[PDB]
Amino acid sequence: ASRILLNNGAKMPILGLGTWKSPPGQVTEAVKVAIDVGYRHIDCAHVYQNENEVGVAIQEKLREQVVKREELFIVSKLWCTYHEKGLVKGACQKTLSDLKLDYLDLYLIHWPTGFKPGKEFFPLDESGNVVPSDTNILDTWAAMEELVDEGLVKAIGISNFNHLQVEMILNKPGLKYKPAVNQIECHPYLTQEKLIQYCQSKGIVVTAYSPLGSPDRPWAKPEDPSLLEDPRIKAIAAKHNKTTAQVLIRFPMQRNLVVIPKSVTPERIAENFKVFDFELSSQDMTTLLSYNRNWRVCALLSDTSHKDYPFHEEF
Ligand SMILES: NC(=O)c1ccc[n+]([C@@H]2O[C@H](COP(=O)([O-])OP(=O)(O)OC[C@H]3O[C@@H](n4cnc5c(N)ncnc54)[C@H](OP(=O)(O)O)[C@@H]3O)[C@@H](O)[C@H]2O)c1
Numbered sequence: 001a002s003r004i005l006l007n008n009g010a011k012m013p014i015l016g017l018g019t020w021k022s023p024p025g026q027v028t029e030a031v032k033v034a035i036d037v038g039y040r041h042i043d044c045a046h047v048y049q050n051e052n053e054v055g056v057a058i059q060e061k062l063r064e065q066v067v068k069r070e071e072l073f074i075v076s077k078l079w080c081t082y083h084e085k086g087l088v089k090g091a092c093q094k095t096l097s098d099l100k101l102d103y104l105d106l107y108l109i110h111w112p113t114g115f116k117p118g119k120e121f122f123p124l125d126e127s128g129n130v131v132p133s134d135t136n137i138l139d140t141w142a143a144m145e146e147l148v149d150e151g152l153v154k155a156i157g158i159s160n161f162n163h164l165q166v167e168m169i170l171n172k173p174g175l176k177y178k179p180a181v182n183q184i185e186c187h188p189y190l191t192q193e194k195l196i197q198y199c200q201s202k203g204i205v206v207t208a209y210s211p212l213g214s215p216d217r218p219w220a221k222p223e224d225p226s227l228l229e230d231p232r233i234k235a236i237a238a239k240h241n242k243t244t245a246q247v248l249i250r251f252p253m254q255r256n257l258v259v260i261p262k263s264v265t266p267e268r269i270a271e272n273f274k275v276f277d278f279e280l281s282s283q284d285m286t287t288l289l290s291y292n293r294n295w296r297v298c299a300l301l302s303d304t305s306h307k308d309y310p311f312h313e314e315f
């Protein structure tokens with residue numbers, strides 16, 4: 001099936017288009033192509049600095065009647081410098097304005113770490129450390145709950161939350177809405193079995209980010225492992241007459257995950273959508289799971305000192 005049911009009773013497309021690092025001069029055409037070929041979920045964020053250009057694409061395709069607003073599933077995220085109760089609404093509203101939407105289908109707390117508010121996304125002290133916010137995740141969650149009750153967003157969720165942090169929200173006194181989604185890094189080198197099982201056990205849908213191992217990540221190094229070039233994964237793809245990327249996308253789909261590969265290349269945008277026509281075997285799935293090495297693309301390395309830094313815990 002192409003959509004998964006969320007605990008808010010809305011349906012979410014299991015395949016979306018990622019937009020981190022998509023250049024502003026290329027992302028409007030990328031999102032136009034993606035909607036033309038069938039994508040109905042766009043993953044965005046204010047920190048990516050391209051929401052205006054994403055929005056231009058969405059609005060044109062609504063105008064052209066290629067799609068209806070109800071058929072789209074648009075996702076954005078609250079940056080770390082906006083965890084303050086009094087800043088959350090304006091951050092959401094700026095995203096809405098830029099995307100030229102009147103609601104978001106899903107708004108996520110981007111990280112459990114809150115940072116000092118201000119112009120800088122990574123505010124630093126004179127010694128180079130990121131300056132934190134004294135706001136805690138539970139008060140940030142209540143501010144997200146307000147957004148639902150104001151009609152700005154249909155669902156709220158979290159991202160890069162470890163199992164104890166998810167539990168902290170689930171156990172929040174006075175909890176009004178559970179998180180619908182936990183968006184986390186997930187691919188054959190970081191298979192996340194524990195955190196996924198916990199989230200699914202609670203009714204929280206997991207979205208897999210960097211599913212191709214983010215080969216365009218700014219800090220990539222030639223000696224890092226490469227999913228797209230892994231000959232073991234290439235061999236599974238060849239067996240199935242699909243590309244390696246297509247296997248990497250289908251793999252989380254069969255774990256009941258949502259997945260959000262990024263591309264600004266039209267050919268690849270289309271390739272990446274052609275994953276509803278084949279099935280990996282259970283053996284294939286277990287083999288791909290065996291490649292785990294707890295290798296992370298996104299570990300927020302500039303702020304491992306934060307109280308709420310998520311990746312010291314084992315999961
Ligand atoms: N919540 C968070 O903290 C968080 C963190 C990281 C990512 N995310 C989200 O997850 C999305 C996906 O993760 P990501 O951007 O890190 O990386 P990714 O989707 O794993 O990999 C994107 C890279 O793969 C290339 N690529 C795409 N399709 C390909 C194909 N079929 N064959 C060969 N290469 C292909 C892209 O190139 P081209 O673009 O040149 O075609 C780009 O260089 C992000 O864009 C963002 O929306 C969220």
Ligand SMILES: NC(=O)[C@@H]1C[C@]2(NC(=O)NC2=O)c2cc(F)ccc2O1
Pocket residue numbers: 020047048049110297298299300301
């Ligand atoms: N270093 C990290 O782990 C994160 C990753 C990350 N990419 C992403 O999609 N979400 C993120 O937060 C990102 C994006 C940025 F625009 C800037 C920094 C940045 O850092």
